A paper describes a structure:
ZER1 and ZYG11B, the substrate receptors of the Cullin 2-RING E3 ubiquitin ligase (CRL2), recognize N-terminal (Nt) glycine degrons and participate in the Nt-myristoylation quality control through the Gly/N-degron pathway. Here we show that ZER1 and ZYG11B can also recognize small Nt-residues other than glycine. Furthermore, we present the crystal structures of ZER1 and ZYG11B bound to various small Nt-residues and uncover the molecular mechanism of non-acetylated substrate recognition by ZER1 and ZYG11B. In conclusion, we propose that ZER1/ZYG11B not only targets Gly/N-degrons for proteasomal degradation, but it also has the ability to bind a defined selection of non-Ac/N-degrons by a conserved molecular mechanism of substrate recognition and target their degradation through the non-Ac/N-degron pathway.
To understand the molecular basis of ZER1/ZYG11B-mediated binding of non-Gly Nt-residue peptides, we determined the crystal structures of ZER1 bound to either SFLH-, AFLH- or TFLH-peptide, as well as the crystal structures of ZYG11B bound to either SFLH-, AFLH- or CFLH- peptide. In line with our SPOT-array results, ZER1 binds to XFLHVGQD peptides in which X is either Ser (KD of 1.3), Ala (KD of 1.6), Thr (KD of 3.1) or Cys (KD of 3.9) more potently than to the Gly-starting peptide (KD of 4.2). Intriguingly, unlike ZER1, ZYG11B was unable to bind to Nt-Thr, although they adopt similar structural architectures. The free α-amino group of the Nt-residue forms hydrogen bonds with the side chains of Asp556 and Asn597 in ZER1 (the counterparts of Asp 526 and Asn 567 in ZYG11B), respectively. Furthermore, the carbonyl oxygen of the Nt-residue is stabilized by two hydrogen bonds from Asn597 and Trp552 in ZER1 (Asp 567 and Trp522 in ZYG11B). Besides, a strong π-π interaction was formed between the aromatic side chain of F2 and the indole ring of Trp 552 in ZER1 (Trp 522 in ZYG11B), this observation is consistent with our SPOT-array results that ZER1 and ZYG11B prefer an aromatic residue at position 2. Our ITC assays indicated that any alanine mutation of W552, D556, N597 or E600 in ZER1, which would disrupt the direct hydrogen bonds with Nt-residue, abolished the binding to the XFLHVGQD (X = Ser, Ala, Cys or Thr) peptides, highlighting the key role of these hydrogen bonds in mediating Nt-residue recognition. In addition, mutating the third-residue-interacting N553 into alanine caused a significant reduction in substrate binding.
Numbering used by the authors:
A (entry chain B): 516 to 689, 691 to 759
B (entry chain D): 516 to 621, 625 to 650, 654 to 690, 692 to 756
């Protein structure tokens, strides 16, 4: 049982604003950000109100006053990944300042890979909408497309993680041909998470039908071959799990 | 995606204590309890740390010190429902004062006493031996609660899976079955588009058929089960 009402995000952002004007990144502020992160999971209404209650400004301002608060950035970027998974709200993330900050966080060594992983997930969900939808001119899409490839092979594929998935469907919709690097990030996420937490994620992956889509990714000629390697690798880890 | 680590639980009972000692139930405290409620969903470890961080004591003290901040009671009883779904931890809720306040609270719609009836149905699933008020005294009071509630009342509750109430659909306590079936029927009578997919999902229809063919089952529970199945087909 649970409950997420929209007043809750508002109160969390008010407390965050206060602890920002107190220049205090205390446990309670990382806590407010983690609470927004949890509350937004697969619930578009709360991402919408986070956007409407000056959420991006508080994000950037806590980036600015606490440049080396690793777990804060982790929580903020998990929240923003959740926000990026609602595509009709993704237009509000298509400004050169938002995309600049996202791409500049592809190299954050904060909490391992979490900040870079979440920034790259946000940008992958932003790329799934197609090449038409970035009417920003700078930064440029192929510039941080390449930067995303660099981030994805930066990460150790046996890295332990500070993240949890209740469903893989948001990643399993990134089965298309419009953006290969989104697709590659999806395959990487699956590979890492069942390589390091098999007992946890190969049941979830089989359950939601990830194997037919990974097989289809190996069976499409348009698919870039390193994604096909990583998909064959996820398939083999999950098949060894079932066996 | 999400992540709630167990340390977060600590912070809320930390913060609650402050504004329990100043007796100020501001929006942030009703949130503190709502956050504990959310962190407890299908996560036994964080209910463990709520219990081990004298959670029951602040439950009692926030019950009495803020007697009619309904949504505070809402959140607290939802939290306690989440902790009651864990079999390991139900022994710590069997003191006669804990059961006292639970059945005695058998509110913003049904929420408080719906949650009281969920906690008590989950403890009764464990059998008459594991009940060391008296058990069929609170059996009549739980039947009474289920016959109070409007079955098409609007709610402020959320279920991501029906699995906790689908394992109470069993013969050790027929009132488990009655409360679970009532829950399913209210929410699929009223929020079908969200919850009848959830019920098909985990294979509820064969179990409801089995409830219609169960000798231990009371005939109004088979009543509601058969009406649930046909609503699900509708």
């Amino acid at each position: 049982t649970f409950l997420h009402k929209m007043g809750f995000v508002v109160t969390m952002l008010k407390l965050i604003q206060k602890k920002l004007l107190d220049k205090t990144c205390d446990q309670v502020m990382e806590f407010s950000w983690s609470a927004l992160w949890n509350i937004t999971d697969e619930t578009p209404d709360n991402c919408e109100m986070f956007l409407n209650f000056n959420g991006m400004k508080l994000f950037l301002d806590c980036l600015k006053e606490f440049p080396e608060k690793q777990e804060l950035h982790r929580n903020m970027l998990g929240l923003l990944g959740n926000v990026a998974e609602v595509k009709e709200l993704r237009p509000q993330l298509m400004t050169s300042q938002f995309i600049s900050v996202f791409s500049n966080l592809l190299e954050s060594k904060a909490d391992g890979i979490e900040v870079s992983y979440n920034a790259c997930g946000v940008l992958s969900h932003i790329m799934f909408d197609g090449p038409e939808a970035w009417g920003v001119c700078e930064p440029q899409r192929e510039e941080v497309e390449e930067r995303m490839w660099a981030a994805i092979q930066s990460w150790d594929i046996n890295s332990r993680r500070n993240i949890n998935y209740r469903s893989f469907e948001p990643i399993l919709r990134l089965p298309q041909g419009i953006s290969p690097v989104s697709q590659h990030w999806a395959t990487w996420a699956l590979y890492n998470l069942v390589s390091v937490y098999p007992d946890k994620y190969c049941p979830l992956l089989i359950k939601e039908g990830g194997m037919p889509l990974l097989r289809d990714i190996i069976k499409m000629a348009t698919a870039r071959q390193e994604t096909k390697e990583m998909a064959r690798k996820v398939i083999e880890h999950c098949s060894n799990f079932k066996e």
